[PDB]
PDB file of C-alpha atoms and ligand atoms in Angstrom:
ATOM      1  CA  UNK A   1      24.000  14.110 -16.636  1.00 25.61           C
ATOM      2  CA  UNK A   2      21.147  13.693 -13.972  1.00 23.55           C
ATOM      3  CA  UNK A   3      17.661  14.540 -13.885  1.00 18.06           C
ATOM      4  CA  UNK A   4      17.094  17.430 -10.983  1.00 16.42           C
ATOM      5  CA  UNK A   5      14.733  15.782  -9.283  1.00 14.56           C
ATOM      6  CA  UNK A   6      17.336  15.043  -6.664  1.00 16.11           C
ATOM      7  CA  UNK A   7      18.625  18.423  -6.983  1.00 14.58           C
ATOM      8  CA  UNK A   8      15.201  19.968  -6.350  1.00 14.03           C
ATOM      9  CA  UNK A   9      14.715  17.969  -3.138  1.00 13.53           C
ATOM     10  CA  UNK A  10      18.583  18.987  -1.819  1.00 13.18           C
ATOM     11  CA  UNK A  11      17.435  22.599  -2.689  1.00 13.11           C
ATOM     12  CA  UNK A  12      14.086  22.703  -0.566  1.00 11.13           C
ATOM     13  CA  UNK A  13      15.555  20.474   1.629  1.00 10.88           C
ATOM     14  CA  UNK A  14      12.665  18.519   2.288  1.00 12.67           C
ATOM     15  CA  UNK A  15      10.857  15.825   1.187  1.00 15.11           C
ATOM     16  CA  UNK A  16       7.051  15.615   1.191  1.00 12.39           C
ATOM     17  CA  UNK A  17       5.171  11.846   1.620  1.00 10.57           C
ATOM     18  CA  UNK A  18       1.992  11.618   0.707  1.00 10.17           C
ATOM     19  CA  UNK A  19       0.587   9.117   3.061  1.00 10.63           C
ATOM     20  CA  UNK A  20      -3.193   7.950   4.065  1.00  7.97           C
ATOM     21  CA  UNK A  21      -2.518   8.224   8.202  1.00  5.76           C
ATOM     22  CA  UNK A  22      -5.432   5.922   9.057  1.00  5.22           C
ATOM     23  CA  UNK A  23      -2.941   2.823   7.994  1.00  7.83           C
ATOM     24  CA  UNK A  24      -2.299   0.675  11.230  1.00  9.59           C
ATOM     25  CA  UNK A  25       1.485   0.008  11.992  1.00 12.85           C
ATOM     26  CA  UNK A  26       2.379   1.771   8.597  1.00 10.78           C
ATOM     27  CA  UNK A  27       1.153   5.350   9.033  1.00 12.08           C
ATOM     28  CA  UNK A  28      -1.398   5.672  11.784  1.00 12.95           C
ATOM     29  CA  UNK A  29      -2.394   9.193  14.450  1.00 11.44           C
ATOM     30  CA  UNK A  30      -1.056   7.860  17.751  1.00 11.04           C
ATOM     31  CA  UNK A  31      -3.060   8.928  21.184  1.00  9.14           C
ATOM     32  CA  UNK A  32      -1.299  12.529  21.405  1.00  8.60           C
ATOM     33  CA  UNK A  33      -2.412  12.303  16.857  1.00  7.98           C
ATOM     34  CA  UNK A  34       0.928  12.658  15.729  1.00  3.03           C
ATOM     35  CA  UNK A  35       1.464  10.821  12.792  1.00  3.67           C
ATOM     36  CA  UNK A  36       3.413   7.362  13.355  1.00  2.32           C
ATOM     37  CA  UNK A  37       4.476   4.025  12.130  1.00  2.00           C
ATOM     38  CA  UNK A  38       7.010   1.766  10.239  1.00  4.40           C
ATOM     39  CA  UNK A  39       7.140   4.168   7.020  1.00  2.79           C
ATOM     40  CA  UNK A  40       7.459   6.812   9.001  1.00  3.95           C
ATOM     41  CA  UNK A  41      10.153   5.807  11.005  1.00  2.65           C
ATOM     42  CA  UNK A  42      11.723   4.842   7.815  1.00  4.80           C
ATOM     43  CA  UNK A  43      11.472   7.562   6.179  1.00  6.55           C
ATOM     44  CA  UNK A  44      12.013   9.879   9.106  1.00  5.31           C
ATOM     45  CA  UNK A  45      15.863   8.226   9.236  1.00  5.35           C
ATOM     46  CA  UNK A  46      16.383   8.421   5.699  1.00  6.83           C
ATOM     47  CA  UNK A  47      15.436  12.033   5.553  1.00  8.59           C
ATOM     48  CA  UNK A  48      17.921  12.825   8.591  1.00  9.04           C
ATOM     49  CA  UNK A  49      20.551  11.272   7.086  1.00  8.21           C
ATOM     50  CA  UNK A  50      19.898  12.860   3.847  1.00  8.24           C
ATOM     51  CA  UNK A  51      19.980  16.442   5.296  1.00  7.98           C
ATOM     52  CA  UNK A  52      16.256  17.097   4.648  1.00  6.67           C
ATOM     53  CA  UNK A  53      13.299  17.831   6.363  1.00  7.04           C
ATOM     54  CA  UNK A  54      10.762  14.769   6.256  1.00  9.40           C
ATOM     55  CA  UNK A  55       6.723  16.200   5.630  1.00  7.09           C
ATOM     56  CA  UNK A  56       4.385  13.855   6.195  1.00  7.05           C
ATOM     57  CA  UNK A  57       1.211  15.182   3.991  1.00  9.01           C
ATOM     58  CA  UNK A  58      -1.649  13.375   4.633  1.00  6.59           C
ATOM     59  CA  UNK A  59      -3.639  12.770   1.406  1.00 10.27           C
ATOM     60  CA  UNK A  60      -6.941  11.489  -0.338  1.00 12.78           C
ATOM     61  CA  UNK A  61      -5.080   8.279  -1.697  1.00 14.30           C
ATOM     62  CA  UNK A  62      -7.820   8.320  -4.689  1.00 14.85           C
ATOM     63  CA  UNK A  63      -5.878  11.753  -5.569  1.00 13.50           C
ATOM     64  CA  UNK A  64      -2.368  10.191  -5.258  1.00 15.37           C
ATOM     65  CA  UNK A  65      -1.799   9.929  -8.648  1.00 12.02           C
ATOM     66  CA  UNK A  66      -2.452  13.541  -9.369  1.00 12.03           C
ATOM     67  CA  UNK A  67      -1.151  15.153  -6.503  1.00 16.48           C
ATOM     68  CA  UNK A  68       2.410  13.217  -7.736  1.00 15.99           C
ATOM     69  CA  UNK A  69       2.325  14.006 -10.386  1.00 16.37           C
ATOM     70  CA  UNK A  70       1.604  18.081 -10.118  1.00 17.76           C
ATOM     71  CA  UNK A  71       4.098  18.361  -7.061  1.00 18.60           C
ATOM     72  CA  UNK A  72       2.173  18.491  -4.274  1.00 20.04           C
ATOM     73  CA  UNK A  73       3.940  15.442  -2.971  1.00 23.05           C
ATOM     74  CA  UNK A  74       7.759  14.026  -4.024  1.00 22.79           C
ATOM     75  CA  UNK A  75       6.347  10.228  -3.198  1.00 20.89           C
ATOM     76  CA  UNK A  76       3.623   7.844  -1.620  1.00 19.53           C
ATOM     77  CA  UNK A  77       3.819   5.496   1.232  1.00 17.25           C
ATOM     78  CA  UNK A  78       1.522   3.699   3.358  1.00 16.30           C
ATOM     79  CA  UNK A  79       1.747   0.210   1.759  1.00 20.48           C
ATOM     80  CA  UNK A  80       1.704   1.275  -1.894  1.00 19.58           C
ATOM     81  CA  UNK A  81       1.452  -2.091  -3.720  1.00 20.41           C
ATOM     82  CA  UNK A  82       3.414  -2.753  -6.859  1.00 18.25           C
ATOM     83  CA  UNK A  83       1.192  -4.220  -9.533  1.00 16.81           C
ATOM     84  CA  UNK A  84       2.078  -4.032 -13.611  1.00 16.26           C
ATOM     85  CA  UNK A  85      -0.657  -1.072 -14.707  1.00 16.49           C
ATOM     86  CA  UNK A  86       1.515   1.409 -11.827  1.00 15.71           C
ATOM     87  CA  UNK A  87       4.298   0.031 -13.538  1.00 16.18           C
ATOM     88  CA  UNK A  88       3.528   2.427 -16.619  1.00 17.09           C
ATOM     89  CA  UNK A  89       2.085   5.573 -14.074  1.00 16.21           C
ATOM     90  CA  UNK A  90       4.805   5.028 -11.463  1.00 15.25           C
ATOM     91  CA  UNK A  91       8.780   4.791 -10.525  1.00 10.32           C
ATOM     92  CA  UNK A  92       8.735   2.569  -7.666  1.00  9.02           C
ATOM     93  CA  UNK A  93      11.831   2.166  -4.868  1.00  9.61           C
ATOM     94  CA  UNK A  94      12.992  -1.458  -4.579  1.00 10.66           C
ATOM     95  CA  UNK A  95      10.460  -3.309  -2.463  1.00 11.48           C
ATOM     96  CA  UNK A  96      10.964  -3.308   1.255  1.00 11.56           C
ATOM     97  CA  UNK A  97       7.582  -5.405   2.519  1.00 11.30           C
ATOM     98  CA  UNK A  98       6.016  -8.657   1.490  1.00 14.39           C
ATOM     99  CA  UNK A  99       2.264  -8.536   1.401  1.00 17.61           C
ATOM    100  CA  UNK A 100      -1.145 -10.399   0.515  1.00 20.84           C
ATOM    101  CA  UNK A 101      -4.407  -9.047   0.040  1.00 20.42           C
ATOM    102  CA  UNK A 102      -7.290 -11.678   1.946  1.00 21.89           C
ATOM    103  CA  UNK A 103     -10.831 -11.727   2.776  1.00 24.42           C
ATOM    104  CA  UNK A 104     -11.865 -10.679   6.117  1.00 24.94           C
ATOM    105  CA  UNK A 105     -15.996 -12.323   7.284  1.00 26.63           C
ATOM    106  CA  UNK A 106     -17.650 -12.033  10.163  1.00 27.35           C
ATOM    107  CA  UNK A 107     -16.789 -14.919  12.274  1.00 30.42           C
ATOM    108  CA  UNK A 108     -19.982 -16.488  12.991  1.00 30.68           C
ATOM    109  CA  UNK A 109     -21.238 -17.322   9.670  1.00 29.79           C
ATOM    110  CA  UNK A 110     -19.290 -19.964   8.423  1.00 29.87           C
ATOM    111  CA  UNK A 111     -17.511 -18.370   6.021  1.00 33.55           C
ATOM    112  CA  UNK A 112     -14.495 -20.976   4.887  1.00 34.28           C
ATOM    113  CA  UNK A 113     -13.911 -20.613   1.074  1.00 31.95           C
ATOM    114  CA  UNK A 114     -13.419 -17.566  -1.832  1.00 29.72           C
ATOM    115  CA  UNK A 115     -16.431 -19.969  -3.405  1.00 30.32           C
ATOM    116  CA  UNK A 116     -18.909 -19.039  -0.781  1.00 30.80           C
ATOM    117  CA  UNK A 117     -18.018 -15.302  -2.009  1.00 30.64           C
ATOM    118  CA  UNK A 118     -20.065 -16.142  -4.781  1.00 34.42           C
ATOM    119  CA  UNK A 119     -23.479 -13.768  -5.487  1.00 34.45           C
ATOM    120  CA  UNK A 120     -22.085 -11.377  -2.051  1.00 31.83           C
ATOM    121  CA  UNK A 121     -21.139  -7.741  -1.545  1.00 27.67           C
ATOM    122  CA  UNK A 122     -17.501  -7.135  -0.938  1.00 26.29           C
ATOM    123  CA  UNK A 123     -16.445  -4.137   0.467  1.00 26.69           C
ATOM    124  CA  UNK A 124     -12.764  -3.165  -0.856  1.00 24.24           C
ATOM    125  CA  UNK A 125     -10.680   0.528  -0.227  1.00 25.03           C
ATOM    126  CA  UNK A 126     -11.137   2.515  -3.348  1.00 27.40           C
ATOM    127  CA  UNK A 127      -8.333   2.998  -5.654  1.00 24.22           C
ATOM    128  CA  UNK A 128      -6.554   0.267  -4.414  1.00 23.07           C
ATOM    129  CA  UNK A 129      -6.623  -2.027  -7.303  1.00 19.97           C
ATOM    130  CA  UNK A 130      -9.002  -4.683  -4.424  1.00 15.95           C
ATOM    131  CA  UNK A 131     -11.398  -4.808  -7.073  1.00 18.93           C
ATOM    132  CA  UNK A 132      -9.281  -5.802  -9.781  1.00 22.42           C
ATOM    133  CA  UNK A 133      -7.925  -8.436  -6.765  1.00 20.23           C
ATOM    134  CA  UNK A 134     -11.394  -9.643  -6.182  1.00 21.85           C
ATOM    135  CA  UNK A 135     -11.693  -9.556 -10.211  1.00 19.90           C
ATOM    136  CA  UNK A 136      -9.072 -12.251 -10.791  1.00 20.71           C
ATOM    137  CA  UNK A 137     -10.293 -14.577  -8.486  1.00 21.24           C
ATOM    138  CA  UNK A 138     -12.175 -17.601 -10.700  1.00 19.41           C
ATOM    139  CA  UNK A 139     -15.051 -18.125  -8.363  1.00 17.09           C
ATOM    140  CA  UNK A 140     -15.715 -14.416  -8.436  1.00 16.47           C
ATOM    141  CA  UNK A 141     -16.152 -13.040 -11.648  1.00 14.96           C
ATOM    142  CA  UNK A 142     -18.971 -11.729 -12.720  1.00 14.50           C
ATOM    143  CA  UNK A 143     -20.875 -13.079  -9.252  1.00 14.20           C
ATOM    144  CA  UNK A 144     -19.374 -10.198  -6.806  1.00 12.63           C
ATOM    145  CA  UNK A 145     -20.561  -6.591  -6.213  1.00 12.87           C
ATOM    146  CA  UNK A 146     -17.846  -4.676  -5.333  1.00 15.18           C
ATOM    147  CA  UNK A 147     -18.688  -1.294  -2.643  1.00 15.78           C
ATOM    148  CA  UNK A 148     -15.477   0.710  -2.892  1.00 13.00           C
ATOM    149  CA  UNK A 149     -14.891   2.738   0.326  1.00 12.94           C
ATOM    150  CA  UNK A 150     -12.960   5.904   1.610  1.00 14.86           C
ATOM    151  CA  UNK A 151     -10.853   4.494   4.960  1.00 14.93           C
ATOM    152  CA  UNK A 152     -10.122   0.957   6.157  1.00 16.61           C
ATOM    153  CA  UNK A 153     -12.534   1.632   9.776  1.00 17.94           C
ATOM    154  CA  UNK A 154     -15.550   2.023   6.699  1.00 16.04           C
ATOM    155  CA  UNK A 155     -14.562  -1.867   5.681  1.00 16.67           C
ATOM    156  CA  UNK A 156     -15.307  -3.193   9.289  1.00 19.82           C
ATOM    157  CA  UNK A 157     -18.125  -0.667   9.751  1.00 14.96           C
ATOM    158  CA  UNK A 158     -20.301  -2.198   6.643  1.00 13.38           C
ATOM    159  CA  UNK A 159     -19.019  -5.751   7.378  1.00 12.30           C
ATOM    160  CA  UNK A 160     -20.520  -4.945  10.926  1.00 11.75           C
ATOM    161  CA  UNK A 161     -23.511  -3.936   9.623  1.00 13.05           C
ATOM    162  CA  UNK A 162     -24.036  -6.063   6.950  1.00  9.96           C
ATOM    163  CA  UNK A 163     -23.979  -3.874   4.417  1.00 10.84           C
ATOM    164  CA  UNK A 164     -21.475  -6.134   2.608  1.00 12.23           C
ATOM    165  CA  UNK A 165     -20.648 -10.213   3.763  1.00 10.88           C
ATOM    166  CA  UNK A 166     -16.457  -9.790   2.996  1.00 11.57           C
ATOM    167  CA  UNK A 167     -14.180  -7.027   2.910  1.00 11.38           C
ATOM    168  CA  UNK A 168     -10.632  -7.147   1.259  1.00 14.00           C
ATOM    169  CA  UNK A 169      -7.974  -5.951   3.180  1.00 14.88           C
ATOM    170  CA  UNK A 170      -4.169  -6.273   3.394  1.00 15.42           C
ATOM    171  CA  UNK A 171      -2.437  -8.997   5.326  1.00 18.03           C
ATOM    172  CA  UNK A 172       0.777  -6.589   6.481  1.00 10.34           C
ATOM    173  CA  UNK A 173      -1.494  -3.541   8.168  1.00  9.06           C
ATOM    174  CA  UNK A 174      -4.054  -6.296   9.483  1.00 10.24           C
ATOM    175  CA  UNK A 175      -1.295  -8.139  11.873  1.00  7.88           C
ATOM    176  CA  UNK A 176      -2.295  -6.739  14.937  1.00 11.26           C
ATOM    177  CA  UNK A 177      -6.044  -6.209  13.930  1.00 13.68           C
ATOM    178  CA  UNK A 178      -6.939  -9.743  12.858  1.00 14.46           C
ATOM    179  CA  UNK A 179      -4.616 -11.091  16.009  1.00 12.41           C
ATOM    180  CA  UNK A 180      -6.568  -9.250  18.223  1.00 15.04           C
ATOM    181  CA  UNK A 181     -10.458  -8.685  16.843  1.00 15.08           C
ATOM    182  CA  UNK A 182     -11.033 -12.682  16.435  1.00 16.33           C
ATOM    183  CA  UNK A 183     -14.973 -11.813  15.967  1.00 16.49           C
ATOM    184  CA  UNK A 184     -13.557 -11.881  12.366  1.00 19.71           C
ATOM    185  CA  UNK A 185     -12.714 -14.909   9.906  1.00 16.66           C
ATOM    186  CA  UNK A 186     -10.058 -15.006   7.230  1.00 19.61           C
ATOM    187  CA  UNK A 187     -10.734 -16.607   4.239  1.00 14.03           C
ATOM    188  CA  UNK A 188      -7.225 -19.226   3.997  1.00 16.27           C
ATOM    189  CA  UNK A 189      -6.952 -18.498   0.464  1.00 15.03           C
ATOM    190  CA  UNK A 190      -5.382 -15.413  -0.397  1.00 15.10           C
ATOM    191  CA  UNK A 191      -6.348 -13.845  -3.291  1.00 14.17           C
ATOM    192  CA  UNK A 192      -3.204 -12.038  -3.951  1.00 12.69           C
ATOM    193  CA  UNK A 193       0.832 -11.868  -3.228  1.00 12.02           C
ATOM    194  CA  UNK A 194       2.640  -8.718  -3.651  1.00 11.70           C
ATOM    195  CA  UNK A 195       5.377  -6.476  -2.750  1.00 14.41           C
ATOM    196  CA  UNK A 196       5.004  -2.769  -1.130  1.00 16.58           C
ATOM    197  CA  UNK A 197       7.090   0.007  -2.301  1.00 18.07           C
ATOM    198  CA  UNK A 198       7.563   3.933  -2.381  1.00 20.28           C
ATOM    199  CA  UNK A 199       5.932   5.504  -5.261  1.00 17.58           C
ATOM    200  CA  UNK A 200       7.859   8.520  -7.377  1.00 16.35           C
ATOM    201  CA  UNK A 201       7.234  10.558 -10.276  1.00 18.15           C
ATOM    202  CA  UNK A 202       8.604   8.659 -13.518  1.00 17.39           C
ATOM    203  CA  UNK A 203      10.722  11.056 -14.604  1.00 16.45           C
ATOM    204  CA  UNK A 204      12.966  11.220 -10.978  1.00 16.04           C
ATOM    205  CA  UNK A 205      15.196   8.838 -11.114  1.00 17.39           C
ATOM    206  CA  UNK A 206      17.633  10.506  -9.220  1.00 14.84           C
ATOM    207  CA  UNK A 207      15.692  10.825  -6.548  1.00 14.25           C
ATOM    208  CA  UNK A 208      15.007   7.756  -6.190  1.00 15.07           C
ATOM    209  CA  UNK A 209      18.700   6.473  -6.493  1.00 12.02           C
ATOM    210  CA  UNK A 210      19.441   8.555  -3.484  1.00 11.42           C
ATOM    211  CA  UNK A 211      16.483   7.155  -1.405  1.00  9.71           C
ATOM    212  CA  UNK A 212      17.401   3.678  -2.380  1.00 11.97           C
ATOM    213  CA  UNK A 213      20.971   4.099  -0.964  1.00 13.59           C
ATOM    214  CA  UNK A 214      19.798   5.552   1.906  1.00 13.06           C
ATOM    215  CA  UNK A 215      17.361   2.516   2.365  1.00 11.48           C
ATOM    216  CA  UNK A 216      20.169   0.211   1.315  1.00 15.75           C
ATOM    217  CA  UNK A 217      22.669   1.464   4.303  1.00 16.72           C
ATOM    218  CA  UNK A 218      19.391   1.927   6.697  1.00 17.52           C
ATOM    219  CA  UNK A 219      18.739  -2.229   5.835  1.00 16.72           C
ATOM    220  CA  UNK A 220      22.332  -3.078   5.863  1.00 13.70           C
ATOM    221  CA  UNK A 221      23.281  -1.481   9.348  1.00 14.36           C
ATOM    222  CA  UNK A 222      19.735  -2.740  10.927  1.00 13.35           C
ATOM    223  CA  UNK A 223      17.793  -0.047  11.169  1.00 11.23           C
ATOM    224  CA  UNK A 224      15.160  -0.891   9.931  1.00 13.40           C
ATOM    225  CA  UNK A 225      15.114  -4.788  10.676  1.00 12.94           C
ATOM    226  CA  UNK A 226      14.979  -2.920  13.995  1.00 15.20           C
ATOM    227  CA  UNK A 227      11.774  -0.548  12.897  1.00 15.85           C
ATOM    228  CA  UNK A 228      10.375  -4.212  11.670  1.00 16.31           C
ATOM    229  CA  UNK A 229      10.711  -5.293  14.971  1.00 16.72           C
ATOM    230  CA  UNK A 230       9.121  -2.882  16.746  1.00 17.47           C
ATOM    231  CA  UNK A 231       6.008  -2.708  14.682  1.00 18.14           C
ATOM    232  CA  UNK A 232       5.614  -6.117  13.794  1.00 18.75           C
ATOM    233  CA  UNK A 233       7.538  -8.729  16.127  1.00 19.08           C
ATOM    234  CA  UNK A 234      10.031  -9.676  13.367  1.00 20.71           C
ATOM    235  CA  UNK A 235      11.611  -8.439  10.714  1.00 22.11           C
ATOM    236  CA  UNK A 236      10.044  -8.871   7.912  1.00 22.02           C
ATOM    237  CA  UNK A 237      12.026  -6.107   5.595  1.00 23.43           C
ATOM    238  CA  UNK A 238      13.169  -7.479   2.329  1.00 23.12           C
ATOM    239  CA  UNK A 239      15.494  -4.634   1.345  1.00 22.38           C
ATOM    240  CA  UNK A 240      18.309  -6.721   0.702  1.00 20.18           C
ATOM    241  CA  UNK A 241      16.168  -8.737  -1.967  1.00 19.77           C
ATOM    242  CA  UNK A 242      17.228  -8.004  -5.542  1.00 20.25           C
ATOM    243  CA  UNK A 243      14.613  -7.178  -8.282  1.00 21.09           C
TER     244      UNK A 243
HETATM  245  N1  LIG B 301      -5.012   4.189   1.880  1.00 20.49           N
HETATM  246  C1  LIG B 301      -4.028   3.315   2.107  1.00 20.49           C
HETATM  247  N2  LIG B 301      -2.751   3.688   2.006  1.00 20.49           N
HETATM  248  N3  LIG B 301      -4.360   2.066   2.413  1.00 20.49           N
HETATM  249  C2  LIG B 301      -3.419   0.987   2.642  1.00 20.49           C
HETATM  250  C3  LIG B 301      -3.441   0.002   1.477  1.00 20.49           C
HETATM  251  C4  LIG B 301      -2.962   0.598   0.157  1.00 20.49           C
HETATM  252  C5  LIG B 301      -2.899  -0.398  -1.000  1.00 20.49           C
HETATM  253  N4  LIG B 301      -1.855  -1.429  -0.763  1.00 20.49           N
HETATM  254  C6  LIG B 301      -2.593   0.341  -2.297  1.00 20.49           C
HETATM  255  O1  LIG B 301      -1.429   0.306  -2.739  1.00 20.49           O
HETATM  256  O2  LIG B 301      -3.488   0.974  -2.873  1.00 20.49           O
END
C-alpha cells in the first residue's frame, strides 16, 4: 500500500522545515531571535496535532533542492512559489497563499513603468526563479542585467546604494515593508501571479496526504484564517480552493 514516507515521520516523530528565517511575516527571528511567523504558526499546529515534534532548520534556500532531497529536511516553507519546472523536481501541498512578484524603485526617481526597466540592473533573490520573472517580461528581455543576491535586506541594500535601479521582490512578505518604508515605489504592473505552497520530496506522497488533512481541518475550523489575521490584517488563506 503506502509509501513510508509518512511512516518515517510518525517514527522520528518529527518533522524538519527547511525555511530561510530572514522572510518577514512568513518566517522571520523575532526581538528575543526565535524563529516566527505565519508558516510557522502553521506548521507548529499541524505538527501538534499530528503528534510530532516541529524543527524549524534554517537553510541556504540555493541548497533547498539538495538538502530535500538527501534528508536533511522532510519539506520547504517560507513562500515557496509553485511554478511548472518545480513541478517535475517537487511534490507540492495544495496552495494556501496568493502571491505576485513586483518591482520595488527608489521613490524619487520617477520610476512608473516595467518599460523604464529597460537597459537597468535588477537585483532579484537567487534561486528564486526572479530572473526567469524578470525574463518573461516583453520590455525586458535581453535589455536587463540581473544581480542575484543571498537575503532579501541585500535587495534594499544595493537598491540603496545604487548598485542596481529595481529589485524584484514578493508582494505577500512585502505587506508591511512597502506599507511602511514609502521611500520606495512599486512598479503597478506586476510581473507575475502565483500561488505559495509546501515543498516535499516526490516520492512522499503520504506525507503529504497527512499534512494536507491536517491543513484542511486547521482551514476548516479557522485556525489559520486566524494565523492570516494576525500576520496580515485579513485572511488571505486559500486552503479551501481546489486545484
Ligand atoms: N528565501 C526565501 N524563502 N525567500 C522568500 C521568497 C521565496 C520565493 N517565493 C521562492 O519560492 O523561491
Amino acid at each position: 500500500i503506502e509509501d513510508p514516507s509518512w511512516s518515517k515521520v510518525q517514527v522520528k516523530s518529527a518533522l524538519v522545515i527547511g525555511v530561510s528565517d530572514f522572510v518577514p511575516i512568513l518566517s522571520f527571528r523575532n526581538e528575543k531571535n526565535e524563529i516566527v511567523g505565519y508558516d510557522i504558526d502553521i506548521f507548529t499546529e499541524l505538527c501538534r496535532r499530528l503528534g510530532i515534534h516541529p524543527i524549524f532548520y534554517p537553510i541556504q534556500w540555493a541548497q533547498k533542492e539538495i538538502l530535500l532531497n538527501t534528508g536533511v529536511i522532510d519539506c520547504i516553507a517560507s513562500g515557496f512559489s509553485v511554478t511548472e519546472e518545480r513541478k517535475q523536481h517537487y511534490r507540492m501541498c495544495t496552495p494556501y497563499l496568493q502571491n505576485a512578484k513586483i518591482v520595488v524603485t527608489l521613490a524619487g526617481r520617477g520610476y512608473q513603468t516595467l518599460a523604464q526597466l529597460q537597459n537597468r540592473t535588477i537585483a532579484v533573490e537567487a534561486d528564486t526563479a526572479g530572473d526567469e520573472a524578470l525574463l518573461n517580461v516583453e520590455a525586458l528581455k535581453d535589455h536587463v542585467i540581473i544581480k542575484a543576491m543571498a537575503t532579501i535586506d541585500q535587495l534594499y541594500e544595493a537598491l540603496d546604494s545604487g548598485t542596481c535601479d529595481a529589485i524584484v521582490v514578493d508582494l505577500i512578505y512585502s505587506l508591511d515593508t512597502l506599507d511602511k518604508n514609502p521611500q520606495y515605489s512599486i512598479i503597478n504592473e506586476a510581473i507575475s501571479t502565483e500561488y505559495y505552497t509546501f515543498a516535499f520530496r516526490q516520492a512522499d506522497a503520504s506525507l503529504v496526504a497527512k499534512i494536507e488533512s491536517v491543513l484542511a481541518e486547521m482551514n476548516e475550523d479557522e485556525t489559520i484564517p486566524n494565523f492570516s489575521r494576525k500576520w496580515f490584517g485579513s485572511n488571505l488563506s486559500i486552503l479551501n480552493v481546489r486545484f
